[PDB]
Design a protein around this ligand. Structure first.
Ligand SMILES: *C(=O)[C@H]1N[C@](C)(CO)[C@](C)([C@H](Cc2ccccc2)NC(=O)[C@H](Cc2c[nH]c3ccccc23)NC(=O)[C@H](Cc2c[nH]c3ccccc23)NC(=O)CCCCC)O[C@@H]1C
Lengths: 233, 239, 230, 204, 222, 229, 231, 229
């Protein structure tokens, strides 16, 4: 009967999928996740959703390694973000299995975004209320950072920010982001943006770095590493 | 805010499944009360038997049901839902005996009914089956009388004594106030029928109540014939 | 029902299934059909208030064959009535396929109440606006399934318009102490007494499953009882 | 036959806190040598190596399905898969195809994460895993390796001695197996480094 | 009104308002009359004329060699029901080698429409049928309704203007049983007042079902 | 060679430890006795992977059953699940199993044939050495034999298979399902696994050329070392 | 599976969901496709990109096949799905028929995807208008089909989609010529987009497919030269 | 049709069915968790509907596998669904990988299932929040999984009735260097603050993952000892 159906995959008078717009709002009310693309790699830095003196910072709530060459930061619902992270990991491994090559970052982004968009356009199910900052490396586009939203729309960003106070982080990145940054410089910029738009415990970091011989490596900074990075700032 | 919470099994702003509680109300619409007492030596379930016409065959107006030869089920609630849960419990027991090779325990049958009520209270397209099920019987592996009560919510719990129906609250109060580790199956049956008679407020005759007294001598489920029920009722009237 | 009467799987705050009892009202609107378990058999009478005089007198059955030994009187939404009749025939056929024997009216009643219950238990279905009285003399069974799926065996079942007065009249007669042949005049008396004068031409479709029919569902011969009335 | 279609010779061996896993380098199409650069031993993780003896097809299919599985497990669990856990993963992968088995036999040579103990796990095509403490053998040279290693293996072989028997005990087997050989490669996984020594076998 | 949204929703008075809406669709169809005799059955229908230059859209259809249906309501629903009827006829001939009975086809149509009303998402057939068939069970006329029920009639009138035709049939109802095929066609034509717009399919215990239009019908227009 | 008999207070399962890759001993210390539950063990003949996986799957099924239902798995329950699973594979899963366990119905030994047939027997021998083992079991098993007598009998049956059957060899593993208190039939069903219960000395490698003569000279084409990271 | 009639007629005879998909297209960025006898030029307005946004490999222009260019206006993910289906279809046409898919055929296929979404229960319409252009053969005239969210497709001498479609289309009509050269078609598209772009060099991108060629993005230097020549 | 999500974003970007399920959790009986240095504890108020209830037949503190245990606050029946799913997932994990599912993997599976029911159509979210305790390489770990499928680790927590006051009480009374004994005492104290009337051993269930890495549900006797110690 669809009496209580919300018509999730239905346009609104303005031509917007209301469920996708509300998912975007949910993201904008979530912890800030900033991505900064430096010379060889990308620094992702997210605000943990679940913090407090009684919370145990054992795992990255928002940072999720997708593959040896791709890491992600989450803004919004960490649950459906985890679902899409599982799908992204499976897609990267399927690409590796098919081609014996690490999935190009844009293809993994396209896959997760096609999942999101399939939820926005078919099935009458709510969209994934998560925005991903997918940092990655591939031989084609070098090191990349992609911002993906619940609509399934993604774009490459040298630097960007999502979540709470994402506009302030974006403005700070515009003011201070420079090309050809070093890993240290980009980490400092991300820490500065996070602090200016918001504590090491609450914050989590992940540096993708491409070395010529070692390849692309994802390193999600632990509590102690993030504490050291914050104290450096 | 849409009104799905009050018509479907989705949570309301208070986090309540309104349809589950309304299925509790539908269970109480059965207009009958069942009192089950499980002693060390026996489990007696007595459910007052109401026939609305003299033209209805009384043998068909039942709330006691054979699920397996061992497991009985006193089902209180909407007669259609009671029939559905009788056949569902029997199918659960049959599937369990086929997969596992032995008769379903009352506990596992109660858990399977709880899972059905959980899928009713979680799947919005499935109604909560308005049946309070008192599953009972002698579990051979433990050689002890299992007595589980599964609510329309699916809230399944083993009970030393339980009640269902309209006077479930009063019957439960009487059970938890006067319960004992009765020494004989006759004592268990007397207590069950006395509790049911007291909470219902009407002196019962064998026709007016179905009694299943599963003992170790007779562990197979069976409604007590009206002569044994009459003897139990006389014993109740004896004191 | 303040919104609790549109979805069949929706309980009223009081636990009522409003769609189910609306189907029951559909049953109540229909002309009365009553089965009586007699000593020689079971007699299913069904009042047929011919809305149009052009209706074929020997047609528009309210009572249907389910088996060589099971008849099904129907009350209420005629589409649902025949849907349940065909589903009961299918249930009996599937029962024979699974078990090789003929289903019994109690067991057929349980299996068909399964479908009745599915109507208001799973979404996307409509409760069956019909009551079905399955009579079998082989089984000595007269089981009526109500739209809810509540099925009960009866000594004398009756559903439809004036079904309460019909039940009261059926109480006055010990059907199991009389044969179907001598129960036919009594059942016809009851139906005629409770018949509404709004219809001048009407019939009493009377089937019986008796020793005379060897338990077979047989429409009562017109010689035994003239169903036509004007 | 399809099991001998690609002649294979994989030989894991236990030393003193060090494992070896050696393989013939031949890719042969039955009696034809296609390549001498075929990789049958794959690093699963820093302390797990998988020598896949059998159909080069199934060697790559199972290596890449196991890489898929291990990469997913290490992403989800954020820790390297243990040699025992990878053995169970290989067993599951091979028995998932129980009715259409891979024509590959695995030989897992690893070091246990804590004690650095050698871990050998040889299985048949469908994951029936042995856990020899001395040596695991696989491939068309299976019986040859069994005999040579049964006589040759000694406890507590240091990485040098462990490599020496892996190489000798593999050379003897491949040089009796017509369809396997054409060079060998021995991965010596010790507690701190992996030494990949390409050994000269007969090229006939 | 609020209960008039689905064919699955009963109203508080135990009615399926969407079924009644499909019924009203049928009632707004062109006049269709059916008559039954001891040996022949006839369905005469005033074929709809959407325009003066449009040939009247056929409504008297040929289903089985001895069964014909006059569809009144949604023509596309009637055509889908006729495809279903052809499937049932084909399967009956396959199984038993004999022509299915119009009573059995009416039962299948009733079941199909009842299914269309017993499940959400599917809609009652806006079309109502007058199926006449002369088989082993004799000549039989059935009015199949969108609700999923059929009525066996000696005679019937459906669609617009149906009241006058129904009254005329009632007047001569007791005549029809013994009336000759030509007499039955004439009764159908009289009961069904619009000539070219009127088709008339006649079947008999012996003769197959055949449709007469205009000139073929002139011998009986009288 | 696998076997399992019932003694007074429990079941003694036993198995050789040889697994054959055709005519060659693939494994000399293979584990064929597999824990299904604390009260049920299954020894297995047939395809090694088939036995391993069927035993693991039924052990997982009964572990789930005991976790959810809280009930001790029954030997007849384990046997029924194994028989149904082996039957749905029409004998393709070549696992000739002996399920030995204890439940409320006492100690039970069942055999489950690969095709899904099953049977409760006081003593069973299955595998290529099943006939040599079953001779010992036939001539030694009696009602209400004690734990040690049944241990020795089942070990001697496995050893008969080891000695006489080429498909059987190496050691005799035993498992003894009993109750922690023989007097109490409601006492906890325990199992004691005797790994290498018999290690036939005459089956040990008697000789070994310790200074292994070797004239194969290893020539290293390439050596590359990497950190173990 | 979900099969709600998302797209349904309104009492006035309009499919309001198609109208909302058109609104989504309008909120999309402007594309202009122009044709010269031996060239097809698609000029798309780049969305306002900050200094922090990578301007490469995110153009609305795409190649459905070596002979089929595509550009879109509207929801980027809807258009991504349409482009994926269109490329799969071009390869499928090559598989079924040795011939490359005709521009009419591929435009029909994409418009039929949009039509199916307007007809499929539980499927939202594609909020995407697609300018699908190319050459059927070497001797075939260049084609520029425009497929709308409604699933209708029509060939155009020159067309625009997205925001400012009115203004860009008016410019095209005022400045179109029957036999424009490659340079003239490039200038037409570039000026038509220049009228409604804050910046010429930055906000504007161009991709041209010459006869017997594949999709070809304009060089920034050549694009700037054409922009300055137009102005 | 069924497969339309009844959990959908509202105008404010909030899944209102998620908040409704969290409310159901907040009326679902106080459950506490406390991470010790050498273990973790999940206690919970288990006040039966009646004294006639048999406690062991429906326990809120449950074992998912040998190393992971779980308690819940919320709807008992869909907690049992989640628990069956988690035990099945850990059994599948053991079958595939030969070890019990890691604590974090059990938590991620519970979170995935809850998120699934938050996104698929025809279903409501699970009305339970789970406190899952288990060990990991770095130490004991308490985890909370919400009806939304969002999981996160905790040092101490309360989920059910009066869980805000209980969480404040844990903030005040929880310390990092607590032992398993002290964690159990802290959990009992938190339950006492969140419970009115006499808080006895029969009214609470305690599960503990201790130095042994294994989850065990403390019996009523152990709980009595802790109350009286
Ligand atoms: C006494 O009678 C004993 N006999 C032997 C043969 C045991 O050694 C059996 C029957 C035994 C059962 C068993 C159970 C659990 C673990 C191990 C062994 N059977 C085997 O060991 C089998 C024999 C076999 C092979 N094919 C069939 C078909 C029907 C019946 C029996 C068999 N051996 C195997 O399964 C091989 C094991 C193997 C081979 N290479 C290996 C390397 C490393 C580890 C294990 C290896 N596998 C195969 O032959 C491949 C089968 C592929 C099928 C698609 O036990 C009783 C007690």
């Amino acid at each position: 009967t669809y009496r209580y159906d919300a018509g999730t995959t239905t346009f609104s008078s303005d031509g917007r999928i209301l469920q996708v717009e509300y998912a975007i709002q949910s993201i904008n009310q979530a912890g800030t996740a900033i991505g900064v693309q430096f010379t060889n790699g990308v620094v992702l830095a997210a605000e943990k959703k679940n913090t407090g003196r009684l919370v145990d910072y054992l795992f990255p709530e928002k940072m999720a390694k997708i593959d040896g060459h791709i890491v992600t930061a989450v803004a919004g619902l960490t649950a459906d973000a985890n679902t899409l992270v599982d799908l992204m990991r499976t897609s990267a491994q399927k690409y590796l299995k098919t081609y014996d090559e690490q999935m190009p970052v844009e293809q993994l982004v396209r896959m997760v975004c096609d999942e999101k968009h399939s939820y926005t356009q078919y099935g009458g199910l709510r969209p994934y209320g998560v925005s991903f900052l997918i940092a990655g490396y591939d031989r084609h586009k070098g090191c990349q950072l992609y911002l993906t939203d619940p609509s399934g729309n993604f774009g490459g960003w040298k630097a960007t920010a999502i979540g709470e106070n994402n506009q302030t982080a974006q403005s700070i990145l515009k003011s201070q982001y420079k090309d050809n940054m070093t890993a240290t410089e980009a980490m400092d910029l991300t820490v500065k943006v996070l602090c200016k738009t918001l504590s090491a415990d609450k914050l989590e970091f992940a540096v993708l770095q491409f070395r010529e011989e070692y390849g692309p490596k994802v390193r999600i900074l632990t509590t102690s590493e993030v504490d050291t990075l914050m104290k450096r700032y | 805010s849409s009104g799905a919470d009050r018509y479907l099994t989705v949570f309301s702003a208070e986090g309540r499944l309104w349809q589950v509680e309304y299925s509790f109300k539908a269970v109480k619409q059965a207009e009958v009360t069942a009192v089950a007492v499980k002693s060390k030596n026996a489990v007696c379930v007595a459910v007052q038997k109401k026939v609305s016409d003299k033209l209805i065959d009384p043998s068909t107006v039942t709330h006691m049901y054979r699920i397996t030869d061992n497991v009985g089920a006193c089902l209180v609630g909407l007669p259609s839902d009671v029939n559905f849960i009788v056949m569902l419990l029997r199918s659960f027991a049959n599937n369990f005996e086929y997969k596992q090779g032995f008769s379903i325990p009352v506990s596992i049958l109660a858990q399977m009914l709880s899972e059905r009520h959980q899928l009713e209270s979680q799947l919005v397209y499935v109604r909560p089956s308005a049946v309070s099920a008192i599953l009972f019987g002698l579990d051979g592996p433990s050689d002890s009388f299992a007595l589980y009560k599964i609510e329309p919510s699916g809230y399944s719990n083993g009970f030393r004594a339980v009640a269902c129906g309209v006077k479930e609250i009063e019957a439960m109060s009487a059970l938890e106030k006067k319960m004992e580790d009765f020494e004989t199956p006759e004592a268990t049956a007397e207590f069950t029928l006395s509790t049911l008679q007291t909470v219902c407020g009407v002196d019962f005759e064998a026709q007016d109540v179905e009694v299943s007294l599963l003992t170790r001598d007779n562990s197979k489920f069976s409604k007590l014939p009206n002569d044994k029920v009459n003897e139990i009722l006389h014993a109740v009237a004896e004191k | 029902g303040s919104g609790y009467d549109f979805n069949p799987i929706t309980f009223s705050p009081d636990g009522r299934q409003f769609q189910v009892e609306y189907a029951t009202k559909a049953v109540e609107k229909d002309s009365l059909a009553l089965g009586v378990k007699c000593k020689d058999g079971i007699l299913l009478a069904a009042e047929k208030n011919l809305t149009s005089t052009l209706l074929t007198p020997g047609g528009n059955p309210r009572i249907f064959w389910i088996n060589d030994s099971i008849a099904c009187a129907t009350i209420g939404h005629r589409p649902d009535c025949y849907s349940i009749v065909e589903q009961s025939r299918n249930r009996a056929e599937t029962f024979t396929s699974n078990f090789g024997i003929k289903i019994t009216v109690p067991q057929l009643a349980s299996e068909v109440s399964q479908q009745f219950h599915l109507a208001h238990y799973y979404q996307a279905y409509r409760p069956f606006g019909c009551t079905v009285i399955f009579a079998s003399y082989k089984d000595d069974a007269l089981y009526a399934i109500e739209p809810s799926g509540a099925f009960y065996g009866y000594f004398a079942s009756c559903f439809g318009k004036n079904s309460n007065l019909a039940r009261a009249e059926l109480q006055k007669t010990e059907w199991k102490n009389i044969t179907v042949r001598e129960a036919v005049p009594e059942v016809a008396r009851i139906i005629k007494s409770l018949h509404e004068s709004q219809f001048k031409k009407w019939e009493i479709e009377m089937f019986w499953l008796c020793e005379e029919t060897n338990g077979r569902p047989q429409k009562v011969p017109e010689d035994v009882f003239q169903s036509r009335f004007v | 036959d399809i099991s001998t279609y690609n002649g294979s010779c994989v030989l894991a061996m236990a030393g003193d806190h060090c494992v070896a896993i050696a393989s013939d380098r031949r890719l042969g199409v039955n009696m034809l040598t296609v390549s001498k650069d075929f990789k049958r031993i794959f690093q699963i993780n820093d302390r797990i190596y998988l020598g896949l003896a059998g159909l080069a097809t199934d060697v790559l299919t199972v290596r890449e399905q196991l890489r898929f599985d291990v990469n997913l497990l290490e992403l989800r669990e954020e820790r390297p898969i243990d040699p025992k856990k990878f053995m169970n993963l290989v067993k599951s992968t091979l028995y998932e195809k129980r009715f259409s088995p891979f024509f590959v036999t695995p030989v897992i040579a690893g070091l246990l994460p804590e004690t650095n103990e050698p871990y050998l796990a040889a299985s048949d095509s469908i994951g029936a895993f042995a856990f020899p403490k001395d040596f695991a053998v696989a491939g068309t040279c299976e019986e040859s390796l069994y005999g040579i290693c049964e006589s040759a293996w000694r406890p507590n072989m240091n990485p040098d001695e462990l490599f020496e028997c892996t190489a000798k005990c593999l050379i003897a087997a491949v040089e009796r197996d017509s369809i396997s050989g054409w060079g060998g490669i021995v991965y010596i996984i010790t507690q701190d480094k992996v030494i990949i020594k390409e050994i000269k076998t007969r090229m006939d | 009104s609020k209960y008039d949204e689905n064919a699955t929703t009963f109203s508080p008075e135990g009615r399926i308002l969407q079924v009644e809406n499909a019924m009203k669709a049928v009632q707004q169809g062109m006049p269709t009359v059916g008559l039954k005799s001891k040996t022949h059955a006839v369905i005469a229908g005033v074929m709809h004329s959407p325009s003066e230059f449009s040939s009247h859209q056929p409504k008297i259809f040929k289903i089985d060699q001895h069964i014909g249906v006059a569809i009144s309501g949604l023509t596309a629903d009637g055509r889908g029901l006729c495809k279903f009827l052809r499937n049932e006829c084909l399967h009956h001939t396959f199984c038993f080698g004999t022509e299915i009975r119009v009573a059995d086809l009416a039962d299948t149509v009733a079941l199909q429409s009842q299914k269309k009303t017993s499940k959400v998402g599917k809609r009652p057939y806006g079309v109502g049928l007058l199926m006449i068939g002369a088989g082993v069970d004799g000549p039989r006329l059935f009015e199949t309704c969108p609700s999923g029920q059929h009525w066996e009639y000696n005679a019937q009138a459906i669609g617009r203007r149906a009241q006058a035709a129904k009254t005329y049939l009632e007047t001569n109802l007791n005549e029809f049983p013994d009336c000759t095929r030509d007499q039955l066609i004439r009764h159908a034509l009289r009961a069904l007042n619009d000539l070219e717009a009127i088709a008339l399919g006649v079947v008999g215990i012996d003769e197959p079902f055949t449709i007469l239009e205009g000139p073929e019908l002139q011998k009986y227009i009288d | 060679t696998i076997a399992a008999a019932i003694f007074d207070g429990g079941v003694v399962l036993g198995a050789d430890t040889r697994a054959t890759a055709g005519p060659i001993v693939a494994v000399k210390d293979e584990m064929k006795l597999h824990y299904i539950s604390d009260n049920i063990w299954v020894c297995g003949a047939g395809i090694a992977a088939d036995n391993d996986n069927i035993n693991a799957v039924i052990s997982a099924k009964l572990r789930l059953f005991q976790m959810n239902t809280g009930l001790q798995p029954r030997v007849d329950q384990c046997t029924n699940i194994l028989a149904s699973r082996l039957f749905q594979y029409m004998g393709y899963i070549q696992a000739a199993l002996i399920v030995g366990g204890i439940d409320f119905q006492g100690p039970q030994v069942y055999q489950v044939a690969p095709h899904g047939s099953f049977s409760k027997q006081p003593f069973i021998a299955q595998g290529s050495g099943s006939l040599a083992a079953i001779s010992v079991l036939e001539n030694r098993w009696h009602n209400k034999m004690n734990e040690h007598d049944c241990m020795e009998m089942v070990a001697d049956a496995i050893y008969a298979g080891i000695t006489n059957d080429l498909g059987s060899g190496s050691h005799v593993n035993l498992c003894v399902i009993k109750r922690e208190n023989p007097e109490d039939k409601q006492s906890k069903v325990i199992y004691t696994f005797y790994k290498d219960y018999r290690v036939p000395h005459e089956n040990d490698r008697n000789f070994r050329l310790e200074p292994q003569i070797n004239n194969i000279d290893v020539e290293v084409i390439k050596t590359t070392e990497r950190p173990l990271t | 599976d979900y099969t709600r009639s998302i797209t349904r007629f309104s009492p006035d005879g309009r499919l309001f969901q198609i109208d909302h998909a058109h609104a989504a297209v309008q909120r999309g960025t402007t594309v202009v496709a122009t044709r010269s006898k031996d060239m097809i030029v698609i000029a798309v307005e780049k969305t306002a990109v900050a200094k922090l946004q990578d301007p490469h490999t995110f153009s609305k222009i795409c190649s459905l096949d070596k002979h089929v260019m595509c550009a879109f206006a509207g929801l980027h993910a809807d258009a991504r799905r349409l482009i994926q289906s269109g490329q799969r279809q071009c390869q499928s046409h090559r598989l079924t028929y040795e011939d490359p898919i005709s521009i009419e055929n591929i435009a029909r296929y994409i418009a039929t995807l949009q039509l199916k979404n307007t007809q499929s229960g539980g499927a939202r319409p594609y909020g995407v208008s697609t300018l699908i252009c190319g050459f059927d053969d070497m001797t075939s005239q260049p084609h520029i089909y425009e497929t709308l969210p409604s699933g209708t497709y029509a060939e155009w001498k020159a067309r625009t989609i997205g925001r400012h479609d009115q203004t860009v289309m008016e410019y095209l009509e005022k400045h179109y010529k029957d036999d424009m050269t490659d340079e003239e078609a490039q200038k037409l598209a570039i000026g038509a987009l220049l009228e409604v772009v804050e910046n010429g060099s930055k906000n504007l991108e161009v991709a041209y497919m010459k006869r017997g060629g594949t999709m070809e993005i304009m060089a920034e230097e050549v694009l700037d030269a054409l922009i300055e020549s137009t102005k | 049709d069924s497969d339309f999500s009844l959990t959908t974003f509202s105008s404010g970007g909030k899944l209102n069915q998620i908040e409704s399920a969290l409310k159901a959790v907040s009326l679902g009986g106080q459950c506490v968790g406390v991470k010790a240095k050498n273990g973790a504890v999940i206690a919970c108020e288990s006040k039966p509907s009646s004294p006639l209830v048999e406690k062991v037949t429906n326990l809120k503190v449950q074992k998912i596998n040998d190393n992971v245990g779980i308690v819940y606050s919320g709807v008992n029946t869909d907690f049992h669904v989640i628990l069956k799913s988690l035990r099945k997932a850990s059994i599948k994990y053991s079958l595939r990988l030969g070890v019990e599912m890691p604590t974090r993997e059990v938590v991620k599976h519970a979170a995935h299932k809850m998120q699934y029911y938050t996104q698929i159509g025809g279903v409501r979210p699970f009305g339970v929040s789970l406190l899952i305790i288990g060990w990991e390489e770095l130490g004991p770990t308490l985890w909370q999984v919400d009806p939304s499928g969002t999981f996160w680790a905790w040092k101490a927590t309360a989920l059910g009735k009066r869980s805000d006051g209980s969480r404040t009480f844990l903030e005040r009374r929880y310390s990092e260097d607590q032992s398993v004994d002290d964690a159990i005492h802290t959990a009992i104290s938190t339950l006492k603050e969140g419970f009115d009337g006499q808080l006895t051993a029969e009214l609470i269930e305690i599960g503990v993952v201790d130095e042994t890495r294994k989850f065990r549900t403390l019996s009523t006797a152990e709980i009595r000892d802790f109350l009286t110690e």
